[PDB]
From a paper:
Growth/differentiation factors 8 and 11 (GDF8/myostatin and GDF11/BMP11, respectively) are two closely related members of the activin/inhibin subclass that share ~90% sequence identity in their mature, C-terminal signaling domains and ~52% identity in their N-terminal prodomains. The ligand dimer elicits signal transduction by symmetrically binding two type II and two type I transmembrane serine/threonine kinase receptors. Similar to other ligands in the activin/inhibin subclass, GDF8 and GDF11 predominantly signal through the type II receptors, activin receptor kinase IIA (ActRIIA; ACVR2A) and ActRIIB (ACVR2B) and the type I receptors, activin-like receptor kinase 4 (ALK4; ACVR1B) and ALK5 (TβRI).
The complex of the GDF11 dimer bound to two molecules of FS288 was resolved using X-ray crystallography to 2.35 Å. This is the first structure of GDF11 bound to a known antagonist. As expected, follistatin domains 1 (D1) and D2 overlap with the type II binding epitope, whereas the follistatin N-terminal domain (ND) occupies the type I binding slot. The overall structure of GDF11:FS288 is highly similar to that of the GDF8:FS288 complex (Fig. 3a; overall root-mean-square deviation (RMSD) = 0.657 Å). Nonetheless, the structure of GDF11:FS288 reveals minor changes in the positioning of residues in the helix of ND. This is consistent with other ligand:FS structures, showing that the ND helix is quite plastic in its “molding” to accommodate ligand differences at the type I interface. However, examination of the type I interface revealed two unique interactions in the wrist of GDF11 compared to GDF8. The second unique feature of GDF11 is the formation of an additional hydrogen bond between the backbone (Y49A) of the pre-helix loop and Q62A located on the C-terminal side of the wrist helix.
Numbering used by the authors:
A (entry chain A), C (entry chain B): 1 to 109
B (entry chain D): 1 to 170, 173 to 246, 249 to 288
D (entry chain C): 1 to 172, 175 to 246, 251 to 288
């Protein structure tokens, strides 16, 4: 609702959330038991003007334009965890909720 | 005019999407919440509205009904009781033969498949069924579908997972499990663990030795030897972690009470004696 | 603590928080009554490899390297509000806590 | 080895700053929390530790004591009770002559200046004193320091502020305040407001006109005219906001379900209504 969703055959130029599946086996990571893959998604698009901005600080940096200050970037503004079953350092079977695995929303920061 | 991602509950437009647009251009797509304001104003007016006045005024939503609303796959537009369009979850439960309860990947039992699919749509995009029936404790009478097999986690919850059983077979990749069994690699330890259905645990890198104390075992990589007096075997544990809090007391295998499981681990690391939680709570 | 702070006397290339004073009068914004100025700070620096990263999603995107992914950006990972006295649209004197005005910490996202 | 921004409270290293470093290089600065791990490992190992095992193991803090710790300005390194170095707030309160309570910019009263400076350091870096003594309600007997003057906000809290005095002349929108006064610009309306010490409010854009009803007043920008029978003047109000409570007594001496319910009744009838007191009129 507060975010914009796009797919690959979208012509949306603005900061947007695109689909992306991460496959743990295709990385070779046998220490992850489940899931084998999941929808991680990612952010991509332009951040011009005041568009897609959540916090007023962004606009203020743009005005000040200090040294080394890059324009706003299209970046996650909301993240979700996934539940995982995996082997820890002791090779124990561990279930855990892993934060910051899924991008729910993209915005200009 | 200006195009906005949503109308807030205060009735105002929020999150600037596009400027210098007509209502028709702004509302041309099937997106539910897109909203529009007519007045073209300067940045500082826009900024004042968004940050200091709750959003842009005279916010006009593009979609007041379900017409031309595209909720996407798995969802359908329905007018609610206050007569506003909402994209609700409406999965296809048509061709589902199992009508009983199911165990979800999140370890929660759902009343049926359709219910899990509805929870998948609303809140958990990764949610799937791992096995039919209720989620269980222990793998006893858990009959996993297909090539998947049963394992339990640290709190004895049962999961149906697909163990990968193709290890690259190989040096000093040898590991000594807590079962006193030597494994060629971590992969084999993992697959043996996966096949056993429960954690075996790594005692120390290298071949298992018939140690009679921790003096016989050299721990590599900042680890310390802890001796298990119940089975007469040692293990190399990190012993580096600190204890922070609202701790919950535990009863340890030495039949003593500790402030927390973490406090127990420290006493274990200090004394060189393996300690494990006997039961939760203080030793009565 | 979870973030790195720099000043003009830093040769720090990594994502870092720098000082930045915002002067509302020097922007001409008379509709802000108080404060006349405040320390906003800003983020600046490189985001390479796994450095200065908080969430695992970032690393997973770098590996996948999907189309339109610009790489991690140096961005605020923690924001603070400030209290403000200002004129609303009705030109009423309003006191309010305004979120997302100060950057407390910068990281690679 | 690896260089980390901090040791977490579980004792493990977090947030990778630099790789392939000696402890000496990693710990060469005065930064309090910087920590080091000896083992050089590959990416997937670092990742497993950071994300799935609480952080990097065998985390060695560069600073075990306050020695060589640079806390920066306003802070000093003190060993805590668990004998670990912490940068605590210690501002300079020695040359402060006022020893009574102070009113902070946050509208909160502090026990003294030093207390405010410590609250400034711990939680509000922008916190300053706006005037001496306790924060007050209304501007009565609030003597603002220097050239600053007193105003009240929406809940009658007193503030000492610097009004804008040099408004830039408009090439020329004139504004009509609720006071029936025409102002050359928003800047001028604001400065009259600031000097008055309380909200005047915008009646409508443009010159004030001697209206005899709302028919004389053209409201712009989705606004509707509401007539104020107490002063015989009109106002353009948005009447757009939605209302979700407070029972209230309105200036028409009627009881409404809420100020929200009252405003809607006002917008409906075209009659300006304001809260007289909370509760029923009977």
């Amino acid at each position: 609702n507060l975010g914009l969703d796009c797919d690959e055959h979208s012509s949306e130029s603005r900061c947007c959330r695109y689909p992306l599946t991460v496959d743990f086996e295709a990385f070779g990571w046998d220490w992850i038991i489940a899931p084998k893959r999941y929808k991680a998604n990612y952010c991509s698009g332009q951040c011009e003007y005041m568009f897609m901005q959540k916090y007023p600080h962004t606009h203020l940096v743009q005005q000040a334009n200090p040294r080394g200050s890059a324009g706003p970037c299209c970046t996650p503004t909301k993240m979700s965890p996934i539940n995982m079953l995996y082997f820890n350092d002791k090779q124990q079977i561990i279930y855990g909720k892993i934060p910051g695995m899924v991008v729910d929303r993209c915005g200009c920061s | 005019g200006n195009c906005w991602l949503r109308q807030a509950k205060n009735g105002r437009c929020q999150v600037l999407y596009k400027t210098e647009l007509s209502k028709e251009e702004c509302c041309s797509t099937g997106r539910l919440s897109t909203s529009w304001t007519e007045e073209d104003v300067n940045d500082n007016t826009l900024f004042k509205w968004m940050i200091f006045n709750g959003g842009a005024p005279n916010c006009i939503p593009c979609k007041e009904t379900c017409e031309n609303v595209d909720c996407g796959p798995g969802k359908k537009c329905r007018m609610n009781k206050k007569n506003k369009p909402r994209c609700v979850c409406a999965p296809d439960c048509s061709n589902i033969t199992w009508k009983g309860p199911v165990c979800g990947l999140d370890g929660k039992t759902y009343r049926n498949e359709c219910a899990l699919l509805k929870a998948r749509c609303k809140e958990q995009p990764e949610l799937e069924v791992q096995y039919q029936g209720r989620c269980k404790k222990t793998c006893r009478d858990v009959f996993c579908p297909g090539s998947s097999t049963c394992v339990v986690d640290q709190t004895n919850n049962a999961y149906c997972v697909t163990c990968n059983r193709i290890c690259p077979e190989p040096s000093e990749q040898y590991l000594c499990g807590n079962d006193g069994v030597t494994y060629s690699s971590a992969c084999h330890l993992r697959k043996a663990t996966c096949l056993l259905g429960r954690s075996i645990g790594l005692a120390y890198e290298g071949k298992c030795i018939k140690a009679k104390s921790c003096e016989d075992i050299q721990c590599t990589g900042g680890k310390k030897c802890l001796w298990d007096f119940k089975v007469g075997r040692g293990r190399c544990s990190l012993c580096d972690e600190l204890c922070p809090k609202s701790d919950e007391p535990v009863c340890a295998s030495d039949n003593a009470t500790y402030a927390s499981e973490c406090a127990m681990k420290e006493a274990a690391c200090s004394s060189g004696v393996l300690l494990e939680v006997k039961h939760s709570g203080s030793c009565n």
